[PDB]
């Protein structure tokens, strides 16, 4: 058997039992309702300037409380789009652009022309307006293939912000430094929200007290739910005891739950999160079995057993592979039960199909390993994409979503372009990150490898090539979000967020997640 030593879960049992102080919760909830209405009337406030209406929305979003005003914010942005009036300053133009695009409104990038010379190059004279540069920078990340008028925005705004940063007052200085490390659009929502509330807004001299309080109270209250969900999931995982039965598998239920929190954090997605975290944990095991344990023979049998998908096959499997197999079979049988109530069990199959698919590809992966085969990039991707596990997760995220319909699942089943881009981003960056290690273990069928061999190029060029793939992928994800959308935006976000997570997790080529996990599931925002 392969020699392995995954680090035991560094979390212990801190998340095993969480008792919600009902009083505090009802206390928090009660004021939040009040603060919610105050904020609402703030948005419905008439006679506001564009600049100001945009900042109010920008702030509410960064504070992570915008999920309470989806309609109001939509109408306000909608009307702004329709009245499409060109604002004269870089700062408002960039924010106006970003906010609309993120919401699907295909505002024209024409708005940025007045800010550049004849050769569509940004006017250097702008280099002295930090706020304008910051918003341009944040805006340059939501561009699509049709926005080549913004092909310099990123480099232009970056070089100057770096140059101006050191002498800026706080928290602005922190905000700029952070943005240069993590743009807003490609970051994990709750993660970016915790930072803004605590590190920026709270230290903002001009801060709106009603909003800040609202933001802190809401974040902390929601955290109670998350802490509550994680507690449940921790028992579930503990009461499976793979930690003992399957000593080869990792113990990362907490890390998985975090991933889930990145896809969606709102309370309505509570059940969704719990179903989704179970699949990630499970598939986590399967990977370990293929990646470091099972034998070509066993694996072969395992894959076959998964395709047939029926209890009886258990016998055909080794002892340990039976634990996995049955667990998996029961998991999906549970989803069906959970979905019985609302008669949405007919969809679970879509996820099962994704499972069988990923298992097949895992098997191919091992075969190419044994044969020592190095396929051409195209052949690699055809197998390697599914093993990012993204088709599986994306599909699974819909299960708990009470509004997902057969149509939604059918759209997803055809590998829509937005989904393909998200999967590629995961593949491309994971391959760039784990090239070294996998290279050592002798895995000749690794993306960067196939690339190098395929195009007869250096490890560098191969990684550069992959970067453009990911860049193109983002531009596609951004386009996918533009209206008219194939399905409801509600089902696009989970995909967008899956891409955001991978970017945040490999920001610098493990965990990484600790800090975040601590900031989101352990420490509360001190009010």
Ligand X SMILES: CC(C)=CCC/C(C)=C/CC/C(C)=C(\F)COP(=O)(O)OP(=O)(O)O
Annotated binding site for Mg(2+): 287, 291, 430-431, 434, 438
Q: Find the angle CA(358)-CA(359)-CA(364) to the nearest 5 degrees.
A: 95
- Shortest distance, CB of residue 388 to ligand X, whole angstroms? 5
Strand, helix or coil at 268? Answer: helix
Least CB distance from residue 445 to Mg ion, whole Å?
11
Please choose, out of 53-61, 284-292, 409-417, 460-468, the segment that lies near ligand X by the rule CB under 6 A: 284-292
- CB-nearer residue toward Mg ion: 18 or 373: 373
CB 92 within 8 A of CB 51: yes
Eight-class DSSP state of 387: G
Give the H or E element holding residue 230: helix 209-238
Closest approach of ligand X to the CB of residue 5, in Å: 13
Is 192 a binding residue for ligand X by CB under 6 A? The answer is no
For residue 147, give both structure tokens. Answer: 């926005």
Task: Choose the binding region for ligand X from 283-291, 313-321, 396-404, 509-517 (rule: CB under 6 A).
Answer: 283-291
* DSSP structure class, residue 434: S
Least gap, CB of 472 to ligand X (angstroms): 20
- Give yes or no for residue 280 binding ligand X (CB under 6 A): yes
The residue among 389 and 478 lying less far from ligand X, judged by its C-beta, is 389
**Which of 106, 116, 228, 434 touches Mg ion by CB under 5 A?**
434
DSSP 101-114: HHTT----GGGGST
Q: Which does 368 bind (CB under 5 to 8 A by kind): Mg ion, ligand X, none?
A: none
Q: Is 385 a residue that touches Mg ion (CB under 5 A)?
A: no
The answer to whether residues 502 and 430 touch, using CB atoms and an 8 Å cutoff, is yes
Q: Residue 355's closest CA among 314, 325, 319, 312?
A: 325
Structure tokens at 446: 């690794």
Binding mask 394-423 for ligand X (x = CB under 6 A): ------------------------------
* Candidate segments 52-60, 134-142, 278-286, 311-319, binder of ligand X by CB under 6 A: 278-286
Stretch touching Mg ion by CB under 5 A, among 177-185, 220-228, 340-348, 434-442: 434-442
Among 193, 303, 389, 497, binds ligand X (CB under 6 A): 389
259 binds ligand X (CB under 6 A): yes
CB atoms within 10 A of CB 389: 23
Q: Which residues pair with 116 in a beta bridge?
A: 122
- Does 220 interact with Mg ion (rule: CB under 5 A)? no
Q: Contact with ligand X (CB under 6 A): which of 138, 251, 408, 430?
A: 430
Contact 246, 505 (CB under 8 A): no
Of 27 and 247, which CB lies nearer to ligand X in the complex structure? 247
SS3 call for 29: helix
Distance CA 42, CA 48 (A): 10
Residue number with the smallest Cβ distance to Mg ion: 291
Q: Which residues of 124-160 are buried (b: 16+ CB within 10 A; e: fewer)?
A: eebbebbebbbbbbbbbbbbbeebebbebbbebbbeb
Q: Which residues are annotated as a binding site?
A: 250, 287, 291, 427, 430-431, 434, 438
* Peptide bond connecting 406 to the previous residue in cis, omega within 30 degrees of 0: no
* Rounded least distance, CB 320 to ligand X, Å: 18
Give the one residue of 58, 152, 202, 287 binding Mg ion; rule: CB under 5 A.
287
Q: Token digits for 382?
A: 């055809």
Of 291, 408, 449, 503, which one interacts with Mg ion (CB under 5 A)? 291
Residue 208 as a binder of Mg ion (CB under 5 A): the answer is no
Quickly list DSSP for 271-340. HHHHHHHHHHHHHHHHHHHHHTT--HHHHHHHHHHHHH--GGGGGGS-HHHHHHHHHHHHHHHHHHHHHH
The item of ligand X, Mg ion, none sharing an interface with residue 389, based on CB under 5 to 8 Å by kind, is ligand X
291 binds ligand X (CB under 6 A): yes
The answer to the question of residue 129 lying near ligand X (CB under 6 A) is no
Binding residues for (2E,6E)-farnesyl diphosphate: 250, 287, 291, 427, 430
Residue 72 contact, options Mg ion, ligand X, none, Cβ 5-8 Å cut-off depending on partner type: none
366 binds ligand X (CB under 6 A): no
**Count of alpha carbons within 13 Å of 91, Cβ hemisphere only?**
12
Q: How far is the CB of 232 from Mg ion (least distance, A)?
A: 27
Nearest distance from residue 420's CB to ligand X, in Å?
16
Distance from C-alpha of 175 to C-alpha of 173, rounded to nearest angstrom: 5
Say how far apart CA 20 and CA 25 lie, in whole Å: 7
Residue ranges binding ligand X (CB under 6 A): 259, 280, 283-284, 287, 291, 388-389, 430
Residue ranges binding Mg ion (CB under 5 A): 287, 291, 430, 434
């Amino acid at each position: 058997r392969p020699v392995a030593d995954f680090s035991p879960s560094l979390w212990g049992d801190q998340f095993l039992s969480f008792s919600i102080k009902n009083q505090v919760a009802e206390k928090y909830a009660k004021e939040i309702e009040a603060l919610k209405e105050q904020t609402r009337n703030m948005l419905l406030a008439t006679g506001m300037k564009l600049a100001d209406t945009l900042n109010l929305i920008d702030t509410i979003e960064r504070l992570g409380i915008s999920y309470h005003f989806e309609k109001e914010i939509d109408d306000i942005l909608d009307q702004i789009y329709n009245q499409n009036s060109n604002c004269n300053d870089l700062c408002t133009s960039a924010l106006q652009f970003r906010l609309l695009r993120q919401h699907g409104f295909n505002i024209s990038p024409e708005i940025f022309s007045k800010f550049q010379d004849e050769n569509g190059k940004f006017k250097e004279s702008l280099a002295s307006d930090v706020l304008g540069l910051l918003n341009l920078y944040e805006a340059s990340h939501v561009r699509t293939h049709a926005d080549d008028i913004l092909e310099d925005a990123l480099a232009f705004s970056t070089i100057h912000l770096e140059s101006a940063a050191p002498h800026l007052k706080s928290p602005l200085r922190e905000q700029v430094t952070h943005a240069l490390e993590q743009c807003l659009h490609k970051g994990v929502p709750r993660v970016e929200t915790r930072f803004f509330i605590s590190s920026i807004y709270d230290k903002e001299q001009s801060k709106n007290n009603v909003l800040l309080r609202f933001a802190k109270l809401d974040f902390n209250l929601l955290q109670m739910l998350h802490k509550q969900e994680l507690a449940q999931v921790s028992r579930w995982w503990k009461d499976l005891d793979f930690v003992t039965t399957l000593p080869y598998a990792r113990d990362r239920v907490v890390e998985c739950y975090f991933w889930t929190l990145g896809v969606y954090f709102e309370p309505q997605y509570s059940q969704a999160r719990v179903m989704l975290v179970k699949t990630i944990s499970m598939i986590s095991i399967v990977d370990d079995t293929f990646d470091a344990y099972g034998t070509v023979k066993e694996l072969e049998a395992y894959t076959d057993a998964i395709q047939r998908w029926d209890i009886n096959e258990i016998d055909r499997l080794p002892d340990y592979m039976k634990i996995s197999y049955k667990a998996i079979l029961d998991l999906y049988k549970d989803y069906e039960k959970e979905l019985s109530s609302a008669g949405r069990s007919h969809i679970v199959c879509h996820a099962i199909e994704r499972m069988k698919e990923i298992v097949r590809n895992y098997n191919v992966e091992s075969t190419w390993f044994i044969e020592g085969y190095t396929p051409p990039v195209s052949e690699y991707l055809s197998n390697a994409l599914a093993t990012t596990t993204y088709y599986l997760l994306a599909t699974t995220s819909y299960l708990g979503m009470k509004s997902a319909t057969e149509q939604d699942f059918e759209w997803l089943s055809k590998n829509p372009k937005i989904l393909e881009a998200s999967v590629i981003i995961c593949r491309v960056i994971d391959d760039t990150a784990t090239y070294e290690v996998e290279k050592s273990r002798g895995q000749i069928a690794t993306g960067i490898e196939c690339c190098m061999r395929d195009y007869g190029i250096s490890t560098k060029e191969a990684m550069a090539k992959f970067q453009n793939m990911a860049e193109t992928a983002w531009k596609d994800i951004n386009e996918g979000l533009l209206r008219p959308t194939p399905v409801s935006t509600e089902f696009l976000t989970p995909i967008l967020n899956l891409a955001r997570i991978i970017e945040v997790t490999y920001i610098h080529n493990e965990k990484v997640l600790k800090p975040h996990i601590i900031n989101l599931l352990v420490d509360s925002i001190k009010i």
